[PDB]
A paper describes a structure:
To gain an atomic level understanding of the ability of TvIPK to synthesize PP-IPs, we derived crystals of TvIPK17-265 in complex with ADP (1.95 Å resolution; Table EV1). For each asymmetric unit, there is one molecule of TvIPK17-265 in the C2221 space group. The N-terminal residues 17–47 could not be traced, either in this crystal complex, or in a binary complex of full-length TvIPK plus ADP, or in a number of TvIPK17-265/ADP complexes into which we soaked a variety of inositol phosphates.
We have biochemically and structurally characterized a minimalist inositol phosphate kinase (i.e., TvIPK) encoded by Terrestrivirus, a nucleocytoplasmic large (“giant”) DNA virus (NCLDV). We show that TvIPK can synthesize inositol pyrophosphates from a range of scyllo- and myo-IPs, both in vitro and when expressed in yeast cells. We find a heart-shaped ligand binding pocket comprising an array of positively charged and flexible side chains, underlying the observed substrate diversity. A crucial arginine residue in a conserved “G-loop” orients the γ-phosphate of ATP to allow substrate pyrophosphorylation.
Author numbering: 48 to 263
Amino acid sequence: SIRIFPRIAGRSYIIYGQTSGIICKRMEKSDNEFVIYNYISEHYDKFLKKYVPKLYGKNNDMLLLEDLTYNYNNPNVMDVKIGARKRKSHTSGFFSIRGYTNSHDYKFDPDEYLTSESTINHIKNFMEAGGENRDKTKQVLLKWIMKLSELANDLFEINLKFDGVSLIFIYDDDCSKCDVNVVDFSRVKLIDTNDQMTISAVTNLIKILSELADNP
Ligand SMILES: Nc1ncnc2c1ncn2[C@@H]1O[C@H](COP(=O)(O)OP(=O)(O)O)[C@@H](O)[C@H]1O
Ligand SMILES: [Mg+2]
Ligand SMILES: [Mg+2]
């Protein structure tokens, strides 16, 4: 029958697709996520291609999405909420770490407000699976910085309020492959300006990751 997908965070029903390379995500509250994927396809197709998992189509209340973990032997995943929270402030000031591979072992708590030092330590914890090969882990950080920098640049020209959106960071244990993409358009709204809050989240992550990539 059905294979439940190993979600790192979130609340939605997510299962493996019937065929390889697909996950199916239930739209739990409304079809807003589908309305927004279609809006971005129509008005911002370049943003959609670069930064967002492919939407393959819809099956009743289920979105057929590109499985971002598919081509990884040993994927390590971290979900960072960069859009505004429903009614609370961010746990790390500009963003909220929602979860990561092995976070239970590090006594991580998504509800816990973090100092700058604790925020950096959890991102370091997420990177420990990448082992003691400094060079390869440095290249992972630099590839994320490359993509997030372009994203922050591109966000200045996008008139959406990115409420609730997450960055999904992924790297393989052997650090031969990594990526970062934007997911969760369930609460995204149309507006007449760019989203300065979301831009501040991304530039803050770029600062943190840059420090890690340069730190001896
Ligand atoms: N396209 C995807 N590929 C792989 N994992 C995904 C994908 N979309 C979501 N996930 C996983 O599901 C979790 C929740 O996704 P999200 O879209 O934020 O759902 P929710 O609305 O439940 O918060 C993420 O933390 C990640 O682990
Ligand atoms: Mg989410
Ligand atoms: Mg892609």
